[PDB]
Amino acid sequence: IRVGCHKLINHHIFTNLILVFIMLSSAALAAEDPIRSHS
Questions:
Q1: Could you give the CA distance from residue 32 to residue 19 in angstroms, rounded to a whole number?
Q2: What distances in angstroms separate CA 28 from CA 10, 16, 22, 32, one per listed residue?
Q3: Whole-angstrom Cα distance, residue 8 to residue 19?
Q4: Whole-angstrom Cα distance, residue 32 to residue 10?
């Protein structure tokens, strides 16, 4: 079925969790050590 997953895609709770996960992953990229690769 292509409506059960559509309901989750257009869900109010799911479209904001994916938005906050993008910012969390973006912040996780800016806390890396550029010098010490074996850190």
A1: 22
A2: 27, 18, 10, 8
A3: 14
A4: 34
